[PDB]
């Protein structure tokens, strides 16, 4: 195995695949392509780098971070000549020379084979929107494993992401212009993080394939495959207020800063704040075990009946931070029902937060 490749053509692929043999990258020269693979047994990332310079076929496994560090550590425009010799991988560039340990390619684990059942193409920017709109609402380490992940749902010509932790929910829907079957899968959060990281911001489309226990996304020269999660994901339709008689509108940043200040004097553990809505007015209050108090009064557009309702303020703040927009619409029922929060100018995403008593 021998190849010579420019630093900049190696860095991005290396970064993508890098994030005992599990600590190594499988390298393969075959058919004029170098392929770099990393895996944690649950998911797998593959990068394909065309080899334009002379090269010899073969496969090995090298420590992931050390090899990435060497290449990144090399000067801008460095040519990185690499060859297997005995039990070692030699890496050379200018007068920099490195000899890395290896493990047999034979020992590198392969994920089981599977069959694609649902497929679709979408702009990269669409997948970026879908994930960034919802990611933060995933549970962290809930004993309900299906909540530590993101629902990816197809319906009609829309792909939809949903995330909830049982107290708050995010949902986002985007048209992709293809006749899709009705279907749902749960991608574990680690897969979601990786899928988000492979989106370079370029105009290269993404290709999604969904199996019965797997999901695969192809963009450019990268192929990411992850296992899915078991269990019954909740239905976001149940969660959206069936009918809202109470509509609030306010600037996102004003609301954010008011809530952020009130957060200061909220209970450290429970984070509770009270909301008082009345004719064109929102009042936010907070207090902690030390009987310290915060009060915020804001001009809003609000026409319904007066009501008071409590929240975990970090749940509200997460929502407003995730809305990168001028105006926020809030839709209410009563003091003990969930609230729906949206961008005033766009219904693409909706955020639902259950109150505190």
């Amino acid at each position: 195995m021998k190849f010579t490749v420019e630093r900049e053509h190696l860095l991005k692929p290396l970064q993508q695949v890098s994030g005992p043999i599990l600590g190594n990258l499988l390298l393969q020269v075959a058919d004029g392509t170098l392929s770099l693979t990393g895996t944690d047994l649950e998911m797998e990332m593959v990068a394909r780098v065309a080899l334009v310079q002379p090269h010899e076929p073969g496969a090995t496994t090298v420590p992931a971070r050390k090899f990435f560090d060497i290449c990144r550590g090399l000067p801008e425009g460095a040519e990185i000549a690499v060859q297997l010799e005995g039990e070692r991988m030699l890496v050379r560039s200018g007068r920099s020379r490195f000899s890395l340990s290896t493990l047999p390619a034979a020992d590198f684990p392969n994920l089981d084979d599977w069959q694609s059942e649902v497929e679709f193409t979408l702009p990269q920017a669409t997948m970026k929107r879908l994930i960034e709109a919802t990611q933060f609402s995933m549970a962290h380490q809930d004993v309900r494993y299906y909540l530590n992940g993101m629902l990816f749902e197809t319906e009609g010509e829309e792909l939809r992401t949903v995330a909830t932790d049982g107290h708050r929910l995010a949902v986002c829907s985007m048209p992709i212009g293809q006749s899709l079957p009705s279907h749902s899968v749960i991608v574990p959060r680690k897969g979601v993080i990786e899928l988000m990281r492979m989106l370079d911001g370029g105009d290269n489309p993404l290709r999604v394939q969904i199996g019965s226990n797997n999901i695969r996304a192809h963009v450019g020269d990268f192929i990411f495959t992850s296992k899915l999660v078991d269990g019954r994901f909740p239905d976001y339709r149940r969660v959206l207020p069936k009918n809202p008689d109470k509509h609030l509108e306010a600037g996102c940043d004003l609301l954010k800063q008011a809530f952020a200040r009130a957060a200061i004097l909220s209970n450290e553990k429970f984070r509770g704040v009270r909301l008082y809505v009345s004719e064109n007015q929102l009042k936010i209050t907070a207090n902690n075990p030390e009987q310290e108090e915060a009060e915020e009064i804001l001009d809003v557009t609000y026409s319904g009946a007066e009501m008071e309702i409590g929240f975990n303020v970090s749940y509200v703040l997460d929502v407003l931070n995730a809305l990168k927009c001028e105006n926020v619409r809030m839709m209410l029922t009563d003091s003990v029902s969930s609230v729906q929060i949206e961008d005033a100018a766009s219904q693409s995403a909706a955020y639902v937060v259950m109150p505190m008593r």
Partner: peptide
């Protein structure tokens, strides 16, 4: 904190 579901 109330449960969403």
């Amino acid at each position: 904190q109330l449960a969403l579901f």
